[PDB]
Amino acid sequence: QCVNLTAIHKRFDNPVLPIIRGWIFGTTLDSKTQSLLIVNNVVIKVCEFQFCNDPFLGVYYHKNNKSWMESEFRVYSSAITRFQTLLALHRSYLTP
């Protein structure tokens, strides 16, 4: 369920370090190690996560209803020295 995106400088660059919903903390940040996932909506889990190269929470209005917001949990495909921020991205923030 991963999507290639590469904060929003339209260019997108959200690098892993040694509008915001949460964070990913871990080492290899893949299925070979336990990683910590913190997401607000708070849900905090430690699992054998296989994270996306560009993990995020997609945000859109359900059928263009401004009173009904929905999101896509594009963070990992399966379920500390490095971390990255999980952003809330509207499609319009990435398109021309």
Epitope: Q1, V3, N4, H62, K63, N64
Partner: antibody
Framework: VQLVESGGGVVQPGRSLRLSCAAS????????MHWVRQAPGKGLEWVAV????????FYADSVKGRFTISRDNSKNSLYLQMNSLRAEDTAVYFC?????????????????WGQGTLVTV | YELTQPPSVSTARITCGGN??????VHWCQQKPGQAPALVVY???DRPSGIPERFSGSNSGNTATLTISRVEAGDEADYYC???????????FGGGTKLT
Amino acid sequence: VQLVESGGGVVQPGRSLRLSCAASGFTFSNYGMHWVRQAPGKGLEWVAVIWYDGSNKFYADSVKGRFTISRDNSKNSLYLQMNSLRAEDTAVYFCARAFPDSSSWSGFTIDYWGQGTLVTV
Amino acid sequence: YELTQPPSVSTARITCGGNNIERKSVHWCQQKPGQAPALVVYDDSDRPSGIPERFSGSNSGNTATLTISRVEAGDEADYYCQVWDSGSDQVIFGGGTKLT
């Protein structure tokens, strides 16, 4: 807005075939594109979609790992490389222009369809 | 995810069932014999330019409907129901309903 498929024909099982679609009448680089196939006597079956910048490629479960979708914005053209074709892959292949789906973050429906090209395996 | 719709319909109403389909946008395309499909309805009830006001629709509960009023002989085509499945990033098509 027009789409023209080519590269169809007759092949044997186990062999590959590359299809292409020429786009004109619109800015190709601003739209995502779909491939859809229709076996004789059957309904429409989705094959793959590619984003306008070529960064994201999604495939139907039945073709994933065998078919590759790609685009060339400079040449205003769409390609589909089909490897290891089987008898079950006999169908008319269409290229089509994607349209944003309001119920999904980056989902698409299909707006403009080409005439399609027949591939027999 | 899959859609379910009848092989054919003789105002014509074409139904498209699914699991809580209300939460998904339903789109419809019309394919005439010997011709490519064309978009008729999108986002449940919106029409693209060129489509007659005769074409309308709705989406509620576990079913969606394409309603074609004042049906003409020129409408004798295979109408397909499709949605985007965000769970697998696939376009899901129904069997297709033929009008007569």
